């Protein structure tokens, strides 16, 4: 029928009317570093990236101190 | 009226049928709205139908005959529509009545073909009410005969005296015998 | 004519239905003949032969 | 004044050529195509009609035509009316009536000549011979155009269009069963109409007349149908049962029938999305996962972006329940991204499984995914975080400590550790060896695949099923060649 897509596109118009080009530019701050890059790898790199965003992001500089303590 | 009412199941699973009668009467109104809701009470309907406890076998056999063909094959609905005993029902343009008389005529002439090649011996029993309800609407067609279906349905039923009463009140007798033999030579 | 088209048409139902097993027989037999004649014209090509230019 | 006054008449007659040529090509092409043998040639104009509907769904036709450009409304078919034979003078009238409105001006209106649309169908719709196909093929295309812009007091006019449609053909029908290409097409035409005024139904009223009548009209559709139009008529009933019906004793496991060939090249995607939406409330893990992901991968013809974002949203919502949540990897479209932006933080927070923090993170900025209604699967998720986390522990090492991994799982107690881990063992999705020697709970956690471990019984059903699907695909490459050589 393809006629039920109209209210869904109206919901997309409401989501686009919530923030006017705010997620396109704010998310484009990372998309400019993510553009043309394979998005299949961005799920693993974003998985470990967001996983380590809270604490122990790099953790490679700390191993030099953890060698003698552990 | 109701759509997802489940109280009629408990009323149908209950004794003292003086409350079951009007509950089934109101069930016949919403059965066309929702036929699948009775599938849980079909077994109990069969239980109260097989025994001779309930006084009206047509109230159960009509519900079963109108839910079986909505659920599965027309055979199980036909066994209770033909097994409903005495049924007082006038001619209606409803889908239910035209389908039960459609399959009733189709299976009627089907049994007439299964029994037409065996004139004697192992004759299958045919109920009289089948002849009553087939010959009732059949005679209703034979009010004026419409000069098209008299010899046709008279030949499909493979019956002996079904066509002698058709040619009694008929115009253009040579046209009816010439059309009759013309139809007989092409089958 | 109106009601006679059913039972008159049943003869065409049988006449067209009888062609199913017939075309089954033709399609199952004519390919066996196709491999018969195929191997018969294949076995004509023999190894001993003369080489020209 | 000179800009729009001089550039005013160029715009309007832009769609005139494609609309007149389109209605003449599909009208004269369909009637002139199946006119000789309508019953023989079938389903040739079905894909044409649906492709024209989906081609006209995004029409920007009406933007300024309200000011003296509504002359397209009073006109209509006017093809061979009032007489079936001797249509030469009417062949001249075809140019006459189209040329009269183009000399100087034309008297036009918008809401004046709307009700008297039944003047011709009383005596002759088009030619008194092809009344059904010309009546539906005449009325049904042009009615949604005038009935566009559902708002602004058109609901009553839409009701007039309803009683006109039913009163002319579909109160029951024009004749009990058309039983032709306009019957099999009339199924999806009346169905598509029901989807057209379904917004009018759900707008202020509810189900107490027409969709309840759709059962009697649904089984009046004869049982010998291919169930294409009958199944499309079932789609609106199931969607009416989607928002709030909630009874599951009949349609669930009783609606399931012989299931004839109901494809429509869209109905697997949207119908399977419907039955997976209803089968998604009992937390179906095996069936709805693969079949709903397949339905996501289906329907690529017109749009796979604007509509698949909801089946994708529900898809990942029911995927994160199993502990393994696959995100958007192979699809690049700027709709599922913006749809998934609020849900991304929590769907990424599922695997880490922090109870106290993410519990506040959900309700913190949660507006739409928790404002979707009844918060059922998210209120199951709030305590499913620990079950997906302990399933990650099942994917982790065997030995369970009392301080390291118990403190890591935010659950430091001896009883509830083995108790809830045992509640994960009684599920049956994992394998463990419950042994108590000195107090520690061990586990064999053998997740070794069937390699060199009863292989024949392992992929036996894989060989049988794969050969069945590939073999019915062999039938699907044998039969279409027959549908090719059928005409020659």
């Amino acid at each position: 029928m393809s006629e039920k897509k109209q209210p869904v596109d109206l919901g997309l118009l409401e989501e686009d009317d919530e923030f006017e080009e705010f997620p396109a530019e704010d998310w484009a701050g990372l998309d400019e570093d993510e553009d043309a890059h394979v998005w299949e790898d961005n799920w693993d790199d974003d998985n470990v990236e967001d996983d380590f965003s809270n604490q122990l992001r790099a953790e490679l500089e700390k191993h030099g101190y953890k060698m003698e303590t552990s | 009226m109701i759509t997802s009412a489940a109280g009629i199941i408990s009323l149908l699973d209950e004794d003292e049928p003086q409350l079951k009668e009007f509950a089934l009467h109101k069930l016949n109104a919403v059965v066309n709205d929702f036929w699948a809701e009775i599938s849980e009470s079909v077994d109990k309907i069969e239980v109260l139908y097989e025994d001779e406890g309930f006084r009206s076998r047509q109230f159960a056999a009509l519900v079963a005959s109108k839910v079986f063909y909505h659920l599965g094959a027309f055979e199980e609905s036909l066994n209770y529509a033909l097994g409903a005993g005495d049924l007082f029902n006038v001619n209606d343009n409803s889908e239910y009545v035209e389908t039960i008389i459609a399959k009733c005529i189709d299976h009627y002439t089907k049994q007439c073909v299964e029994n037409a090649d065996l004139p004697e011996g192992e004759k299958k029993p045919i109920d009289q009410r089948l002849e009553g309800i087939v010959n009732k609407m059949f005679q209703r067609c034979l009010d004026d005969h419409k000069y098209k279906q008299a010899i046709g349905i008279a030949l499909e039923t493979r019956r002996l005296d079904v066509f002698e009463k058709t040619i009694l009140e008929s115009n253009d007798v040579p046209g009816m015998l010439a059309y009759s033999l013309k139809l007989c030579m092409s089958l | 004519d109106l009601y006679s088209r059913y039972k008159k048409l049943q003869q065409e139902l049988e006449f067209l239905e009888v062609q199913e097993e017939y075309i089954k027989d033709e399609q199952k037999n004519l390919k066996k003949e196709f491999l018969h004649a195929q191997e018969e014209v294949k076995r004509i090509q023999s190894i001993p032969l003369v080489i020209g230019q | 004044p000179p800009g729009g006054g001089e550039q005013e008449p160029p715009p309007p007659p832009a769609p005139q050529d494609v609309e007149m040529k389109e209605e003449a090509a599909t009208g004269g092409g369909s009637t002139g195509e199946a006119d000789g043998k309508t019953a023989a040639a079938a389903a040739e104009h079905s894909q044409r009609e649906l492709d024209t509907v989906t081609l006209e769904d995004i029409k920007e036709h009406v933007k300024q035509l309200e000011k003296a450009v509504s002359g397209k409304e009073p006109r209509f078919v006017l093809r061979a009316l009032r007489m079936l034979p001797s249509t030469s003078r009417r062949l001249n009238h075809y140019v006459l009536y189209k040329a009269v409105q183009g000399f100087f001006t034309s008297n036009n209106a918008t809401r004046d000549f709307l009700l008297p649309f039944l003047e011709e169908p009383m005596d002759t719709e088009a030619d008194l011979q092809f009344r059904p196909r010309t009546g539906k093929a005449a009325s049904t295309p042009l009615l949604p155009e005038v009935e566009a812009y559902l708002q602004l007091l058109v609901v009553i006019f839409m009701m007039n269009s309803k009683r006109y449609k039913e009163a002319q053909k579909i109160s029951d029908d024009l004749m009990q069963k058309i039983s032709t290409q306009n019957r099999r097409a009339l199924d999806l035409v009346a169905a598509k109409c029901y989807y057209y005024h379904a917004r009018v139904y759900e707008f202020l009223d509810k189900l107490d007349v027409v969709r309840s009548f759709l059962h009697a009209r649904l089984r009046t559709a004869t049982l010998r149908h291919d169930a294409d139009g009958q199944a499309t008529l079932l789609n609106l009933l199931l969607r009416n049962y989607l928002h709030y019906s909630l009874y599951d004793q009949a349609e669930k496991l009783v609606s399931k029938s012989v299931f004839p060939e109901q494809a429509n090249n869209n109905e697997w995607a949207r119908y399977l999305y419907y039955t997976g939406r209803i089968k998604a409330i009992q937390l179906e893990y095996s069936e709805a996962r693969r079949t709903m992901t397949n339905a996501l991968r289906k329907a690529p013809q017109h749009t796979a972006v604007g509509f698949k974002q909801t089946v994708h949203k529900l898809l990942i919502v029911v995927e994160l329940l199993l502990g393994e949540i696959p995100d958007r990897l192979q699809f690049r479209q700027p709709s599922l991204k913006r749809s998934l932006m609020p849900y991304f933080l929590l769907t990424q927070a599922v695997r880490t499984g922090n109870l106290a923090k993410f519990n506040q993170v959900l309700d913190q900025f949660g507006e739409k995914f928790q404002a979707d209604g009844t918060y059922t699967l998210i209120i199951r998720l709030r305590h499913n975080v620990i079950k997906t986390g302990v399933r990650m522990i099942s994917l982790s090492y065997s030995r369970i400590s009392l301080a390291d991994i118990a403190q890591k799982l935010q659950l430091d107690s001896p009883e509830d550790a083995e108790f809830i881990v045992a509640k994960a063992i009684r599920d049956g999705v994992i394998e463990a060896s419950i042994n108590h020697e000195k107090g520690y709970v061990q586990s064999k956690e053998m997740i070794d695949i069937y390699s060199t471990r009863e292989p024949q019984l392992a992929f036996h059903q894989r060989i049988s099923f794969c050969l069945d699907i590939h073999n019915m695909s062999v039938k699907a490459m044998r039969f279409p060649p027959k549908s090719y050589n059928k005409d020659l």
Side-chain angles (χ1 to χ4, degrees), chain D residues 331-342:
Chain D
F331 287 165
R332 182 185 65 84
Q333 57 266 13
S335 296
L336 278 69
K337 292 175 69 68
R338 293 182 180 92
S339 296
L340 198 137
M341 283 177 184

mmCIF file with all atom_site columns, all heavy atoms in Angstrom, chain D residues 331-342:
data_model
loop_
_atom_site.group_PDB
_atom_site.id
_atom_site.type_symbol
_atom_site.label_atom_id
_atom_site.label_alt_id
_atom_site.label_comp_id
_atom_site.label_asym_id
_atom_site.label_entity_id
_atom_site.label_seq_id
_atom_site.pdbx_PDB_ins_code
_atom_site.Cartn_x
_atom_site.Cartn_y
_atom_site.Cartn_z
_atom_site.occupancy
_atom_site.B_iso_or_equiv
_atom_site.pdbx_formal_charge
_atom_site.auth_seq_id
_atom_site.auth_comp_id
_atom_site.auth_asym_id
_atom_site.auth_atom_id
_atom_site.pdbx_PDB_model_num
ATOM 1   N N   . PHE D 1 331 ? 24.118 -0.681 6.976  1.00 0.00 ? 331 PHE D N   1
ATOM 2   C CA  . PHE D 1 331 ? 23.143 0.245  6.410  1.00 0.00 ? 331 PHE D CA  1
ATOM 3   C C   . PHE D 1 331 ? 23.571 1.673  6.720  1.00 0.00 ? 331 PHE D C   1
ATOM 4   O O   . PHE D 1 331 ? 23.791 2.021  7.885  1.00 0.00 ? 331 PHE D O   1
ATOM 5   C CB  . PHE D 1 331 ? 21.743 -0.031 6.958  1.00 0.00 ? 331 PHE D CB  1
ATOM 6   C CG  . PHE D 1 331 ? 21.111 -1.279 6.407  1.00 0.00 ? 331 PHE D CG  1
ATOM 7   C CD1 . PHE D 1 331 ? 19.997 -1.834 7.017  1.00 0.00 ? 331 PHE D CD1 1
ATOM 8   C CD2 . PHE D 1 331 ? 21.629 -1.895 5.281  1.00 0.00 ? 331 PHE D CD2 1
ATOM 9   C CE1 . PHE D 1 331 ? 19.413 -2.980 6.513  1.00 0.00 ? 331 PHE D CE1 1
ATOM 10  C CE2 . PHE D 1 331 ? 21.049 -3.042 4.771  1.00 0.00 ? 331 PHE D CE2 1
ATOM 11  C CZ  . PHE D 1 331 ? 19.940 -3.585 5.389  1.00 0.00 ? 331 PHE D CZ  1
ATOM 12  N N   . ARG D 1 332 ? 23.689 2.493  5.678  1.00 0.00 ? 332 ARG D N   1
ATOM 13  C CA  . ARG D 1 332 ? 24.091 3.894  5.803  1.00 0.00 ? 332 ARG D CA  1
ATOM 14  C C   . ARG D 1 332 ? 22.944 4.772  5.311  1.00 0.00 ? 332 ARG D C   1
ATOM 15  O O   . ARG D 1 332 ? 22.749 4.931  4.101  1.00 0.00 ? 332 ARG D O   1
ATOM 16  C CB  . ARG D 1 332 ? 25.371 4.168  5.019  1.00 0.00 ? 332 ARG D CB  1
ATOM 17  C CG  . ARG D 1 332 ? 25.870 5.599  5.134  1.00 0.00 ? 332 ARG D CG  1
ATOM 18  C CD  . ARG D 1 332 ? 27.077 5.837  4.244  1.00 0.00 ? 332 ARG D CD  1
ATOM 19  N NE  . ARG D 1 332 ? 26.748 5.711  2.828  1.00 0.00 ? 332 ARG D NE  1
ATOM 20  C CZ  . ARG D 1 332 ? 26.229 6.688  2.091  1.00 0.00 ? 332 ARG D CZ  1
ATOM 21  N NH1 . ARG D 1 332 ? 25.979 7.871  2.635  1.00 0.00 ? 332 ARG D NH1 1
ATOM 22  N NH2 . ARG D 1 332 ? 25.961 6.483  0.808  1.00 0.00 ? 332 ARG D NH2 1
ATOM 23  N N   . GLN D 1 333 ? 22.185 5.340  6.249  1.00 0.00 ? 333 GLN D N   1
ATOM 24  C CA  . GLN D 1 333 ? 21.091 6.242  5.926  1.00 0.00 ? 333 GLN D CA  1
ATOM 25  C C   . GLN D 1 333 ? 20.884 7.201  7.089  1.00 0.00 ? 333 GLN D C   1
ATOM 26  O O   . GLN D 1 333 ? 20.914 6.767  8.252  1.00 0.00 ? 333 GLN D O   1
ATOM 27  C CB  . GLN D 1 333 ? 19.791 5.485  5.626  1.00 0.00 ? 333 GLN D CB  1
ATOM 28  C CG  . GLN D 1 333 ? 19.316 4.563  6.740  1.00 0.00 ? 333 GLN D CG  1
ATOM 29  C CD  . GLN D 1 333 ? 19.785 3.131  6.556  1.00 0.00 ? 333 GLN D CD  1
ATOM 30  O OE1 . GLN D 1 333 ? 20.664 2.853  5.742  1.00 0.00 ? 333 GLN D OE1 1
ATOM 31  N NE2 . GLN D 1 333 ? 19.195 2.215  7.314  1.00 0.00 ? 333 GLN D NE2 1
ATOM 32  N N   . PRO D 1 334 ? 20.693 8.497  6.822  1.00 0.00 ? 334 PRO D N   1
ATOM 33  C CA  . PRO D 1 334 ? 20.535 9.454  7.925  1.00 0.00 ? 334 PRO D CA  1
ATOM 34  C C   . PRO D 1 334 ? 19.110 9.535  8.451  1.00 0.00 ? 334 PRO D C   1
ATOM 35  O O   . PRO D 1 334 ? 18.588 10.631 8.678  1.00 0.00 ? 334 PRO D O   1
ATOM 36  C CB  . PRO D 1 334 ? 20.970 10.778 7.289  1.00 0.00 ? 334 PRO D CB  1
ATOM 37  C CG  . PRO D 1 334 ? 20.589 10.627 5.853  1.00 0.00 ? 334 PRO D CG  1
ATOM 38  C CD  . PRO D 1 334 ? 20.767 9.165  5.512  1.00 0.00 ? 334 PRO D CD  1
ATOM 39  N N   . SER D 1 335 ? 18.472 8.384  8.649  1.00 0.00 ? 335 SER D N   1
ATOM 40  C CA  . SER D 1 335 ? 17.195 8.300  9.348  1.00 0.00 ? 335 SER D CA  1
ATOM 41  C C   . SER D 1 335 ? 17.268 7.384  10.556 1.00 0.00 ? 335 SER D C   1
ATOM 42  O O   . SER D 1 335 ? 16.834 7.765  11.651 1.00 0.00 ? 335 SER D O   1
ATOM 43  C CB  . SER D 1 335 ? 16.094 7.821  8.388  1.00 0.00 ? 335 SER D CB  1
ATOM 44  O OG  . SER D 1 335 ? 15.876 8.761  7.352  1.00 0.00 ? 335 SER D OG  1
ATOM 45  N N   . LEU D 1 336 ? 17.819 6.180  10.386 1.00 0.00 ? 336 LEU D N   1
ATOM 46  C CA  . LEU D 1 336 ? 18.016 5.279  11.515 1.00 0.00 ? 336 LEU D CA  1
ATOM 47  C C   . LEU D 1 336 ? 19.060 5.825  12.480 1.00 0.00 ? 336 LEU D C   1
ATOM 48  O O   . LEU D 1 336 ? 19.038 5.492  13.670 1.00 0.00 ? 336 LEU D O   1
ATOM 49  C CB  . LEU D 1 336 ? 18.423 3.892  11.016 1.00 0.00 ? 336 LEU D CB  1
ATOM 50  C CG  . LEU D 1 336 ? 17.320 2.942  10.535 1.00 0.00 ? 336 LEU D CG  1
ATOM 51  C CD1 . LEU D 1 336 ? 16.695 3.415  9.230  1.00 0.00 ? 336 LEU D CD1 1
ATOM 52  C CD2 . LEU D 1 336 ? 17.873 1.536  10.373 1.00 0.00 ? 336 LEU D CD2 1
ATOM 53  N N   . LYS D 1 337 ? 19.981 6.654  11.984 1.00 0.00 ? 337 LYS D N   1
ATOM 54  C CA  . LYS D 1 337 ? 20.947 7.304  12.861 1.00 0.00 ? 337 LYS D CA  1
ATOM 55  C C   . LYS D 1 337 ? 20.249 8.248  13.832 1.00 0.00 ? 337 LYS D C   1
ATOM 56  O O   . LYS D 1 337 ? 20.387 8.116  15.053 1.00 0.00 ? 337 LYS D O   1
ATOM 57  C CB  . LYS D 1 337 ? 21.985 8.057  12.030 1.00 0.00 ? 337 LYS D CB  1
ATOM 58  C CG  . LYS D 1 337 ? 22.903 7.160  11.218 1.00 0.00 ? 337 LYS D CG  1
ATOM 59  C CD  . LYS D 1 337 ? 23.830 7.978  10.333 1.00 0.00 ? 337 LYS D CD  1
ATOM 60  C CE  . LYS D 1 337 ? 24.847 8.747  11.161 1.00 0.00 ? 337 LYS D CE  1
ATOM 61  N NZ  . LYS D 1 337 ? 25.816 7.841  11.836 1.00 0.00 ? 337 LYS D NZ  1
ATOM 62  N N   . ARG D 1 338 ? 19.481 9.205  13.302 1.00 0.00 ? 338 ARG D N   1
ATOM 63  C CA  . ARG D 1 338 ? 18.763 10.141 14.161 1.00 0.00 ? 338 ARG D CA  1
ATOM 64  C C   . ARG D 1 338 ? 17.706 9.437  15.001 1.00 0.00 ? 338 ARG D C   1
ATOM 65  O O   . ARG D 1 338 ? 17.399 9.887  16.111 1.00 0.00 ? 338 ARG D O   1
ATOM 66  C CB  . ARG D 1 338 ? 18.118 11.242 13.319 1.00 0.00 ? 338 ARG D CB  1
ATOM 67  C CG  . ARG D 1 338 ? 19.109 12.169 12.636 1.00 0.00 ? 338 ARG D CG  1
ATOM 68  C CD  . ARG D 1 338 ? 18.388 13.258 11.854 1.00 0.00 ? 338 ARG D CD  1
ATOM 69  N NE  . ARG D 1 338 ? 19.317 14.167 11.192 1.00 0.00 ? 338 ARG D NE  1
ATOM 70  C CZ  . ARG D 1 338 ? 19.751 14.014 9.946  1.00 0.00 ? 338 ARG D CZ  1
ATOM 71  N NH1 . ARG D 1 338 ? 19.339 12.983 9.221  1.00 0.00 ? 338 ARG D NH1 1
ATOM 72  N NH2 . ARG D 1 338 ? 20.597 14.891 9.422  1.00 0.00 ? 338 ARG D NH2 1
ATOM 73  N N   . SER D 1 339 ? 17.140 8.340  14.494 1.00 0.00 ? 339 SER D N   1
ATOM 74  C CA  . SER D 1 339 ? 16.179 7.577  15.284 1.00 0.00 ? 339 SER D CA  1
ATOM 75  C C   . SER D 1 339 ? 16.864 6.848  16.434 1.00 0.00 ? 339 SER D C   1
ATOM 76  O O   . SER D 1 339 ? 16.260 6.637  17.492 1.00 0.00 ? 339 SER D O   1
ATOM 77  C CB  . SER D 1 339 ? 15.431 6.589  14.390 1.00 0.00 ? 339 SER D CB  1
ATOM 78  O OG  . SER D 1 339 ? 14.656 7.266  13.416 1.00 0.00 ? 339 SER D OG  1
ATOM 79  N N   . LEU D 1 340 ? 18.122 6.458  16.246 1.00 0.00 ? 340 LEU D N   1
ATOM 80  C CA  . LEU D 1 340 ? 18.863 5.680  17.230 1.00 0.00 ? 340 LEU D CA  1
ATOM 81  C C   . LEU D 1 340 ? 19.726 6.543  18.146 1.00 0.00 ? 340 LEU D C   1
ATOM 82  O O   . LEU D 1 340 ? 20.295 6.018  19.108 1.00 0.00 ? 340 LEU D O   1
ATOM 83  C CB  . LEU D 1 340 ? 19.729 4.637  16.509 1.00 0.00 ? 340 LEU D CB  1
ATOM 84  C CG  . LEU D 1 340 ? 20.292 3.436  17.274 1.00 0.00 ? 340 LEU D CG  1
ATOM 85  C CD1 . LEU D 1 340 ? 20.138 2.172  16.448 1.00 0.00 ? 340 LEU D CD1 1
ATOM 86  C CD2 . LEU D 1 340 ? 21.756 3.657  17.618 1.00 0.00 ? 340 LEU D CD2 1
ATOM 87  N N   . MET D 1 341 ? 19.823 7.847  17.883 1.00 0.00 ? 341 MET D N   1
ATOM 88  C CA  . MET D 1 341 ? 20.656 8.710  18.718 1.00 0.00 ? 341 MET D CA  1
ATOM 89  C C   . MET D 1 341 ? 20.262 8.708  20.192 1.00 0.00 ? 341 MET D C   1
ATOM 90  O O   . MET D 1 341 ? 21.168 8.607  21.039 1.00 0.00 ? 341 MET D O   1
ATOM 91  C CB  . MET D 1 341 ? 20.650 10.141 18.161 1.00 0.00 ? 341 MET D CB  1
ATOM 92  C CG  . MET D 1 341 ? 21.522 10.341 16.934 1.00 0.00 ? 341 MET D CG  1
ATOM 93  S SD  . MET D 1 341 ? 21.422 12.016 16.276 1.00 0.00 ? 341 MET D SD  1
ATOM 94  C CE  . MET D 1 341 ? 22.446 11.866 14.814 1.00 0.00 ? 341 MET D CE  1
ATOM 95  N N   . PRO D 1 342 ? 18.976 8.814  20.580 1.00 0.00 ? 342 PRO D N   1
ATOM 96  C CA  . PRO D 1 342 ? 18.654 8.774  22.014 1.00 0.00 ? 342 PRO D CA  1
ATOM 97  C C   . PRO D 1 342 ? 18.828 7.386  22.606 1.00 0.00 ? 342 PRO D C   1
ATOM 98  O O   . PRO D 1 342 ? 19.159 7.240  23.787 1.00 0.00 ? 342 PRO D O   1
ATOM 99  C CB  . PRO D 1 342 ? 17.186 9.223  22.063 1.00 0.00 ? 342 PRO D CB  1
ATOM 100 C CG  . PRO D 1 342 ? 16.937 9.895  20.753 1.00 0.00 ? 342 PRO D CG  1
ATOM 101 C CD  . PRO D 1 342 ? 17.787 9.151  19.778 1.00 0.00 ? 342 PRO D CD  1
#
